[PDB]
Amino acid sequence: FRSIPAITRYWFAATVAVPLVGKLGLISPAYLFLWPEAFLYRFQIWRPITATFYFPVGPGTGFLYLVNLYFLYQYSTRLETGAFDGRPADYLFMLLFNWICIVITGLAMDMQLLMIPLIMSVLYVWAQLNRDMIVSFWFGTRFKACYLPWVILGFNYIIGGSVINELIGNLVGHLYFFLMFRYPMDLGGRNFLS
Amino acid sequence: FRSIPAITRYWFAATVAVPLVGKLGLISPAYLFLWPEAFLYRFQIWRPITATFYFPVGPGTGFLYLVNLYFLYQYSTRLETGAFDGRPADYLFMLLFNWICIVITGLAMDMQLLMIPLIMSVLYVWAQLNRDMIVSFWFGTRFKACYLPWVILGFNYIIGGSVINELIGNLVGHLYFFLMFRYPMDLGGRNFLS
Amino acid sequence: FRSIPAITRYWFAATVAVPLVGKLGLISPAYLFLWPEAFLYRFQIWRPITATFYFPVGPGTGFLYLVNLYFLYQYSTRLETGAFDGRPADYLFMLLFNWICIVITGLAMDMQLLMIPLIMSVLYVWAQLNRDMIVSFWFGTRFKACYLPWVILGFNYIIGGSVINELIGNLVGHLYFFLMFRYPMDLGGRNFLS
Amino acid sequence: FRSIPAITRYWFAATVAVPLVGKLGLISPAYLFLWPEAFLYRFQIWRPITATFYFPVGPGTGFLYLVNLYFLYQYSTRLETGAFDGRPADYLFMLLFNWICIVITGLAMDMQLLMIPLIMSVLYVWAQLNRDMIVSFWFGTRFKACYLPWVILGFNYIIGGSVINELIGNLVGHLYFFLMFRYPMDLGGRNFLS
């Protein structure tokens, strides 16, 4: 939807374009998995940037991708109209921070598809920046907010799935919230353009 | 109701019937795949024609069959009633022409079940000659014209499998449209039952 | 529900009791499969009576059993209050007829769990004896009757499954309906007790 | 709400927590199975107690965990509030006594995850002394007393797996019921924190 929705729609364009160049057969998808065993000794700088945008699509894994893209579009732009309003280098620094933390803890783990925890992290930091909102749902129209990433884990226990793909992002959101709210000197750097 | 709504609904009857012969267990489904290299060395003229009358319904690929068959019935007779009330022989020639090229481009590539791209070919050919009609869905009535091939491509991309097979059907549909509504000497064949 | 619902509840008691003696581990269920290869040369008179009452239960095949037992209790007792009203040797002769026919045609096939087609057969003969009933459903509250066993096949194509477990019963129901309605001399025999 | 609703909800906290340790990937689930013959030769006192605090949630056995945990929380504190407002030490002795016999009858048989039968043991002990209460379900309010163990056995029989695990839990519940409400000299132990 290129009709000026926000400033950072390049992310949404990348996450809709890269599985289309993966699935069609231009590049064999074996080169996009973020292998830490191939990142330890061999340098191979392709993976930790090409893995955060690619998601594999299969006939049976085709609703997680759609609902994660919906979470991305619907909950990143609310910060774009509510928190990104001016000084956008600050919130680009926010989005880089949990990026580098979750890629280094995915090297600490053995997780290989790094697209879910970043969106879960930005969803949790949305819900934590907007505590005490009376409406959060449409069936149970009254809902206590900020519990949404845990309700995502509840729907994961309904679908079975796994929880290792989400709780690291849901913890790094609390990490950034603590280092922002509690203590100062978590400021940006050079290359300011605003 | 099978009250002969159009002159060529034996296509619909056969594309319902032959998958019941497949799933019933009379002939093995491995005999109906259009193995192209087995069509190359061996003669085997059993399978350029039965491959486009087959779809392996079962555990998981069940909604795709119903949606594509519904779109086939829903738009074939509407193509017949719109700007095709006469000349049924030229309509049969149209239904032959995209087939005799899609069998070649499917023989070069590695596609097996050529049921979906021919249905989206005739849907695309309907889309080119039916501009400004907006009433498409019962719920989504705001769908603009010549967008429905891309959204059924999106449905086959999310629920189904590959994407390279439907794009070549759109390509051969555009090929027939340009070669039929711009240039002469493509009338049809003799001994037509017009 | 032993509270006098009908006359032939012995069938329902058998079909609720035999999977409980199978699943608990008293008898290894390898002796209950109706092997025609063990019925051809070896006599082995256990199988074609012990296989028509036993149904295997697994965590994931646990709704077909419940819905088939519901079809049994709901649609056999309707004949008990509508067609079995007196002279019950006639309808015992009905229930034994399609029993031995689907036994001999399951020997003609290789199908091994003989519980579904008998209930589908008696459901189809119910719907055929009650042609021109205005109500047949609750969501689409107007429904043309006797299409119910084909709607069961439609829900099978939704669930994927297989249609060889139902169409032989749905055909033997039409066989009995033809041999009852069209021609005489399909009468019972001795051991009358009514 | 964790507002300490009863004195022994650490059971509930642990039976929620330890499956997250299992599904998280810290300790392998093969170390927590109560292999009885491996408990026979080897000492291995890691596994009489961790086996009754575990359930392998995931792809397929997900609703059984939620329903059984809901029944545990819903009836443990209601047993505590009904005829057990005093004497918590005898309640703890009750929660020990069925365990120290179910570990023996599970060691003789081949059961692994002793979470379900202890919950239905305490549910059956509740049902045995709570006659004539009819209001049980929010929809099915006509459920008579001392029938709920059989219907949760039916739920575990249809959705879950085996049936031999729950009957010995009902048996040891009846054993404790008769041996506690008829015969003396089973008071408890010294150093009780009453």
Swiss-Prot record, chains A, B, C, D:
Q: Does the keyword Cell membrane apply?
A: no
Q: What is the effect of changing residue 63 to C?
A: Impaired ERAD substrate degradation
- The set of disulfide-linked cysteines is none
How does the record describe its quaternary structure?
A: Homotetramer. The four subunits of the tetramer are arranged in a twofold symmetry. Forms heterooligomers with DERL2 and DERL3; binding to DERL3 is poorer than that between DERL2 and DERL3. Interacts (via SHP-box motif) with VCP. Interacts with AMFR, SELENOS, SEL1L, SELENOK and SYVN1, as well as with SEL1L-SYVN1 and VCP-SELENOS protein complexes; this interaction is weaker than that observed between DERL2 and these complexes. Interacts with NGLY1 and YOD1. Does not bind to EDEM1. Interacts with DNAJB9. Interacts with RNF103. Interacts with HM13. (Microbial infection) Interacts with the cytomegalovirus US11 protein.
GO BP annotations, alphabetical order? cellular response to misfolded protein; endoplasmic reticulum unfolded protein response; ERAD pathway; establishment of protein localization; positive regulation of protein ubiquitination; proteasome-mediated ubiquitin-dependent protein catabolic process; protein destabilization; response to unfolded protein
Q: Name one GO molecular function term.
A: ubiquitin protein ligase binding
- Please give the tissue specificity annotation from the record for this chain: Ubiquitous.
> At which residues is Phosphoserine found?
194
Which cellular component appears as one GO term in the record?
Answer: late endosome
Source domain of life is Eukaryota
Question: How does it sit in the bilayer?
Answer: Multi-pass membrane protein
Residue numbers on the Cytoplasmic membrane side:
83-87, 131-147
Record note on what altering residue 66 to A does: Impaired ERAD substrate degradation
Q: Provide the species name.
A: Homo sapiens
Q: What is this protein called?
A: Derlin-1
Q: Which UniProt keywords apply?
A: Acetylation, Endoplasmic reticulum, Host-virus interaction, Membrane, Phosphoprotein, Protein transport, Transmembrane, Transmembrane helix, Transport, Unfolded protein response
Give a short account of what the protein does: Functional component of endoplasmic reticulum-associated degradation (ERAD) for misfolded lumenal proteins. Forms homotetramers which encircle a large channel traversing the endoplasmic reticulum (ER) membrane. This allows the retrotranslocation of misfolded proteins from the ER into the cytosol where they are ubiquitinated and degraded by the proteasome. The channel has a lateral gate within the membrane which provides direct access to membrane proteins with no need to reenter the ER lumen first. May mediate the interaction between VCP and the misfolded protein.
Compartment(s) of residence: Endoplasmic reticulum membrane
What outcome follows a substitution of residue 173 to V? Reduces interaction with and proteolysis of XBP1 isoform 1
Q: Which stretches are transmembrane?
A: 9-24, 63-82, 88-108, 116-130, 148-159, 164-182
Q: Which residues lie on this side of the membrane: Lumenal?
A: 25-62, 109-115, 160-163
Please give the range of the full-length protein represented by this chain.
8 to 201 of 251
Q: Does the keyword Cell membrane apply?
A: no
Taxonomy of the source species:
Eukaryota, Metazoa, Chordata, Craniata, Vertebrata
